[PDB]
């Protein structure tokens, strides 16, 4: 039983739903932990496929900034390391996920919830979805392996505008630039998507798991290495002059 997610599994599909609609599905410390437990569970269950999606109008507003409790006794420094270790571990869960992993993007997405899409196997989006990684505005560096994946996926010219200059994309833009697999009209979104997924689940289980493994195994060591770099850099930025300023 989870406090920030709703996890179901049926028809060979495990469905992980973000469930803090009141906060636009902001990811707080607890949800970081719960999403890992959930993914650990889905990796071992009898699902063919695993899906992430958001409850309500938002996919996710990304990392919850109420995580500025700042209360740890060891002040910013302890907090920054702890967050960095947590972030590393969290991203690693996506790098290692052995079964097909699919994002059903119901609405706007932000931050870590967008950068992790670079590690998904497919990504289906409503037309009222948008994609935004404004790390620079907050005096921060990129994460979720996006420093590596996004230039390869989008081309460097297009990735820059999004990661460095913090541009916001529409779903059509994100689909054209290779983040998003396909876009559907919002009124028919859920229907068209789940139909498609129900079909995919009827395909030969081990062929799907093994196909992905052949695609992903050789790249995981690189991605882990990117993740580690990204998180050390970020731990610095969190201690920074500019980051502190920028958050306001």
């Amino acid at each position: 039983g989870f406090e920030t997610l709703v996890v179901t599994s049926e028809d060979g599909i495990t469905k992980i739903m973000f469930n803090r609609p009141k906060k636009k599905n902001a990811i707080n410390t607890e949800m970081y932990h719960e999403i890992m437990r959930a993914l650990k569970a889905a990796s071992k269950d009898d699902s063919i496929i695993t899906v992430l999606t958001g409850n309500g109008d938002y996919y996710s507003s990304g990392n919850d900034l109420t995580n500025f409790t700042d209360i740890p006794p060891g002040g910013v420094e302890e907090k920054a390391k702890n967050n960095a270790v947590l972030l590393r571990e969290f991203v690693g869960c996506f790098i290692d996920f052995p079964k097909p992993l699919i994002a059903v993007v119901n609405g706007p997405a932000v931050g870590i919830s967008v950068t992790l899409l670079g590690l998904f196997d497919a990504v289906y989006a409503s037309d009222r979805a948008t994609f935004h990684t404004p790390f620079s505005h907050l005096g921060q560096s990129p994460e979720g392996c996006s420093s590596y994946t996004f230039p390869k996926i989008m081309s460097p010219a297009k990735a820059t505008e999004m990661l460095i200059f913090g541009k916001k994309l529409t779903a059509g833009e994100a689909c054209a630039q290779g983040l998003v697999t396909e876009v559907f009209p919002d009124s028919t979104f859920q229907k068209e998507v789940w139909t498609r997924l129900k079909a995919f689940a009827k395909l030969p289980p081990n062929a799907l798991r093994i196909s992905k493994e052949v695609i992903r195994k050789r790249e995981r060591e690189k991605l882990h290495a990117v993740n580690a770099e990204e998180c050390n850099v970020l731990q610095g930025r969190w201690l920074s002059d500019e980051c502190t300023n920028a958050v306001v």
Copy 2:
């Protein structure tokens, strides 16, 4: 060894060389150019020949309405005295050797896709230098439907070429693409209307052949050399995995 004069004769292929262009055509139109065991061998000999001849450029293309229906499933003779196990190793070794011929081909290599393409015939496009398609061409790699894993180096090339989000739908979930879709996703260089296809393409290729031969060969060599070791590794991994799949519960089932 394998020098030939104007044209080399084969049972499943037509191989000509003219205007500094060697042209390898699949010739089992009756079977939608399905690639049987013999054609695997013949395509290798043909490539070995084109690598050594005086062509500037090399082309693959199909005879008739199809580019290729991919691997011929009449290759379910199953007759080898050693059963499925011997058959599965033998096919793995062959596939490895075959794919490697594409990895190592030293001159510009171009696919002229006259019509539908399937399976190994599509995955190898990730190793071509250019790929020109008729609008009635389609591209399909349904390995999962057959309980199989990816090959042709597509496990590595297709995510880099198409982006993971787009490669997945084609390799894992077996979607079929139109030539417009394949062009947009980077597999295909360009699409032409079917009625003017042959004309526009061969004009373009006759021009390219007039370019400085060694510049072309060396340009490609600079682009390709550093990546061959990796591709050969991918190919080996893919074929070991596939050998397992061919022995599988699911694959056997899925084929029927």
Copy 3:
């Protein structure tokens, strides 16, 4: 600067090719001046750095008014390219018009690239009996896809800005009349962003790739030095 105009304003260093009479062709001096200009912009107080051409042209590429000669040019080219590999701040191309040769290939190392609709991109190395450079042998296949990079690098096709944008070289295209306006507005905004964040973001993206790119550059230059001494290259130059 004899061949360039270098200004720095609003946290933006702007390096303009200035040989409009020669379609901004890049001669032996400009190679050196561009290096000094970058070394400067890397150290100054600009947030961003921009290249652009004066007049109608971005650059006609290496000025053909240019054994000892072939090694010297190889060493220079290697050193020049490296300056683009190593540039630590955001680096942006404002392509006012036609671009050619080295001036295009380097775009693979830029962070963003904005183009007027009367810009075109052309790398006809094969026509001149030459091999690729600017790290394009590595970057262009990855950016465009092998099937699209080949037609441009090996077969020397010329692209429109729309085509280049679709294939990933170019960030965006603007109508020529509004080009300068729209771009500089956009750049002025970017400059207002947190300076260190921007620098460090790029550093995280680029650092791990630099060693590779430098190796590519070296390999490209040794090959090219051979081509410069070639049967075919001499001929082709006519």
